[PDB]
């Protein structure tokens, strides 16, 4: 429930760099892939298992 992003998946570790204002990653299908954890700042790739 990361801030209003309901869904089911596996929160792995990724290696992409975010700009200071960009928060939500996306793709062609407009489904969120990369979300930055609200309390600690890092990258968590979202993949359905």
């Amino acid at each position: 429930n990361f801030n209003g992003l309901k869904g089911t998946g596996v929160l792995t570790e990724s290696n992409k760099k975010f700009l200071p204002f960009q928060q939500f990653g996306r793709d062609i299908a407009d489904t969120t892939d990369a979300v930055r954890d609200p309390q600690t700042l890092e990258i968590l790739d979202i993949t359905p298992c």
Binding site: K16, K17, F18, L19, Q22
Partner: protein, 44 residues
């Protein structure tokens, strides 16, 4: 002083914005590298 002032060179340029459709080509990172306008050319 006021009657004749010597200062360094400077320049400021002003343009004007008009509504258009753009294409943006994102890099492997989040930086925007190229942009293409549509109302410029037949090839565009």
């Amino acid at each position: 002083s006021s009657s004749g002032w010597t200062a360094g060179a400077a320049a400021y340029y002003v343009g004007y914005l008009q509504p258009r459709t753009f294409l943006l080509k994102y890099n492997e990172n989040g930086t925007i590298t190229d942009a293409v306008d549509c109302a410029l050319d037949p090839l565009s």
